[PDB]
């Protein structure tokens, strides 16, 4: 595409530079170019792809929430709605771009549990971001697409990864947020966070000091949500 004339290794190097410079739009464009070279991604490369798009869409979501709040207060000229719609359309375009990379062809080529779970978690997340802005029409279908991606990732992670694996933990955290914030299922969110936390606690004894630090950091996020929800 736009990055078709740049070497894969140069795109990866530039994505790392863009991260250091906090240029996340550039980072995402470099990683899109790398994915479109057609080769599978290593663990580090998958993280670069996810970090780039999470930061781009995170800024869009924060702006959408500011504008949606102003619009709701205005509804209690067309400019606030028009501008919220502009940001919303841009956000949807970024989510569709990520989902398109996962569908062409990252997921189908991902055979190891670590890569397949990582990509299915991403698919759940980007459908979840689409669901946050969706209103009634395909809102149900978007929610089901998120749920289905998260569920397949959960099924694989429970069979193939230990309960302390950081991707398994982050998948459970984000699926619990999906249940609480999107699916109107706070009891399912609380149950998932509690079971995930407890099963990780029981497996910490198997870990090195560095892996212990990685796993306990995500467990604290599960605990923080449980404290907010209970």
């Amino acid at each position: 595409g736009a990055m078709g004339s740049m070497e894969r290794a140069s795109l990866i190097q530039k994505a790392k530079l863009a991260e250091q410079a906090e240029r996340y739009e550039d980072m995402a464009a470099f990683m899109k170019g790398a994915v479109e070279k057609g080769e599978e991604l290593s663990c580090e490369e998958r993280n670069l792809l996810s970090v780039a798009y999470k930061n781009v869409v995170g800024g869009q979501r924060a702006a959408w929430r500011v504008l949606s709040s102003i619009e709701q207060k205005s509804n209690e000229g067309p400019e606030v709605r028009e501008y919220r719609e502009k940001v919303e359309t841009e956000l949807q375009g970024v989510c569709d771009t990520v989902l398109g990379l996962l569908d062409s062809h990252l997921i189908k080529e991902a055979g190891d549990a670590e890569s397949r779970v990582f990509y299915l978690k991403m698919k759940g997340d980007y459908y979840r971001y689409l669901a946050e802005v969706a209103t009634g029409d395909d809102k149900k279908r978007i929610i089901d697409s998120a749920r289905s991606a998260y569920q397949e990732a959960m099924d694989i992670s429970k069979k193939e990864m230990p309960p302390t694996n950081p991707i398994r933990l982050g998948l459970a955290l984000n699926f619990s947020v999906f249940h609480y914030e999107i699916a109107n299922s706070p009891e399912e969110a609380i149950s998932l966070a509690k079971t995930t936390f407890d099963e990780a606690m029981a497996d910490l004894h198997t870990l090195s000091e560095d892996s212990y630090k990685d796993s306990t950091l995500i467990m604290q996020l599960l605990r923080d949500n449980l404290t907010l929800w209970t």
Partner: peptide, 8 residues
């Protein structure tokens, strides 16, 4: 509710 954060 907090999801996995973006990197540092």
């Amino acid at each position: 509710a907090g999801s996995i954060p973006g990197r540092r």
